[PDB]
């Protein structure tokens, strides 16, 4: 029953009674592990923003990181560092713009690199996790640029330098598969494979077109880099799965997250990070609710869980709150994270039973993005 605050008070009281001396200092966070979860608050487009580092097992904030305008957070899967690409202005929201990448030590949270990006080249957009992406070796960060045209910036994290912009076709998002290769999703309904050396034009190859013009693939797909599994819902809860693990795209059988009867009774996915994927269980989790067709970014109160191989529904959870984003820890007996932008609260659930275990409130102004590391 005892809360963190109570346990802390008891410990402070025992130390005082014992005459224990202790030097006030700066704390280090505990070692990154599978139950650490990061929550980013884009703060409804505010000029400065915050990320909260959370122990999901305790439901406790263990650290924070400040950011600028609409930063893109990334987390190395092996737990060795975290980074973001951010944007500041010389007079709050006016004046000279500077875009930069910071890399941070995951335990001290100090910055270990601050790499300027020339000519203010980031895409300023409500936050999509796969618009800035680490390669599997953690040595390169790739960020998306929209203006003047779609392009991808290559940032060397090891030598702590921007390298160059790559020209790409009319495509979006970045799913890295190798030190020198990533995929994007193109307007024409194909994926593009982009393979880049140290200099010169990248080699670009398209897949088959895998969805028609009027099937809408959401801005927040789930991507497991370790599995090479890209899980891409549409507005109706149809789920495309692409296996990129061979280095080339293989299209898996499509699954429906909702049944025909649910679709006829107004059920549709809705929210921000609407989909999660657990790699070891090979399971998909989708935020859904009954909604008009053009209310696709509103919160949802339910999560369906399905087997990714068969499309078989495994569970349907009533979340008990207005949930915008979900994700999962990637360990055995995972947690299911359910973040409410309106409540500014992360609800932590058992992913098996659906039950709310604990919660962490006061997460900024408009928190939206949950990131975890797959350390397994």
């Amino acid at each position: 029953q005892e809360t963190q605050g109570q346990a802390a008070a008891r410990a402070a009281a025992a130390d005082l009674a014992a005459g224990q001396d202790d030097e006030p200092r700066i704390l280090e966070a505990p070692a990154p592990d599978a139950r650490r979860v990061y929550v980013n608050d884009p703060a409804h487009f505010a000029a400065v923003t915050q990320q909260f580092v959370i122990d999901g097992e305790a439901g406790r904030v263990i650290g924070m990181i400040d950011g600028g305008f609409l930063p893109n957070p990334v987390v190395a899967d092996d737990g060795s560092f975290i980074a973001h690409a951010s944007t500041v202005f010389s007079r709050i929201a006016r004046g000279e713009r500077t875009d930069y990448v910071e890399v941070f030590d995951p335990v001290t949270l100090l910055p270990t690199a601050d790499i300027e990006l020339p000519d203010a080249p980031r895409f300023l957009v409500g936050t999509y996790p796969w618009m800035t992406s680490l390669t599997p070796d953690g040595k390169t960060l790739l960020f998306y640029q929209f203006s003047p045209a779609p392009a991808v910036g290559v940032v060397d994290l090891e030598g702590k330098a921007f390298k160059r912009m790559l020209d790409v076709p009319d495509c979006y998002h970045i799913f890295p598969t190798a030190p020198d290769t990533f995929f994007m999703h193109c307007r024409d309904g194909s994926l593009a494979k982009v393979a880049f050396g140290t200099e010169g034009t990248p080699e670009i190859t398209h897949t088959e077109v895998f969805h028609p013009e009027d099937e809408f693939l959401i801005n927040h797909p789930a991507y497991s880099q370790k599995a090479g599994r890209l899980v891409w819902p549409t507005y109706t809860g149809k789920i495309h799965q692409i296996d990129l693990s061979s280095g080339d795209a293989k299209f898996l059988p499509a699954v429906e997250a909702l049944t025909e009867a649910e679709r006829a009774d107004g059920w549709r996915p809705g929210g921000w990070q609407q989909v999660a994927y657990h790699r070891a269980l090979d399971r998909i989790y989708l935020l859904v609710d009954q909604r008009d067709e053009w209310r696709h970014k509103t919160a949802s109160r339910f999560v369906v869980v399905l087997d990714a191989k068969t499309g078989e529904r495994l569970a349907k959870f009533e979340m008990g709150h207005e949930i915008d984003s979900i994700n999962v820890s990637q360990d055995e007996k995972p947690l299911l994270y359910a973040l409410s932008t309106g409540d500014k609260t992360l609800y932590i659930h058992d992913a098996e039973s659906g039950e709310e275990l604990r919660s962490v409130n006061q997460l900024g102004h408009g928190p939206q993005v949950i990131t975890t590391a797959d350390m397994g």
Partner: protein
């Protein structure tokens, strides 16, 4: 009040999120921080870029294209926030996508988001 219910436009109050021109607005209504329905507030810079939506006017029964141009160069106003998404498509159809900061073209290279205006720019069709 039900966030998931079909959105229902009105033509009687431009500061409310159900005003008919606001059918795919994302951010804050400029009329609430000293702009107007189609003008930016003092000190901010009017983008030339936009996302568009076709919004039905219940007054005259016409659907008009609304070009959502941002006013940029100030921190977000924090007044009259709204997010509607009628006809709104994902980012790979960017002319209809509303998470993007549509501040391109604004004077002084301004790119931070303060609020959005809702001018009609043409007939839908």
């Amino acid at each position: 009040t039900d966030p998931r219910a079909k959105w229902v436009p009105q033509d009687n109050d431009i500061q409310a999120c159900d005003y008919w021109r606001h059918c795919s607005i994302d951010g804050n209504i400029c009329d609430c921080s000293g702009g107007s329905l189609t003008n930016c507030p003092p000190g901010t810079k009017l983008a030339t870029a936009s996302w568009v939506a076709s919004c039905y006017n219940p007054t005259d029964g016409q659907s008009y294209l609304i070009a959502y141009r941002d006013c940029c160069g100030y921190n977000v106003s924090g007044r009259c926030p709204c997010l509607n998404t009628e006809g709104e498509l994902p980012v790979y159809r960017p002319e209809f996508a509303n998470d993007i900061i549509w501040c391109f073209g604004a004077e002084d290279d301004a790119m931070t988001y303060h609020c959005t205006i809702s001018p009609i720019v043409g007939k839908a069709s």
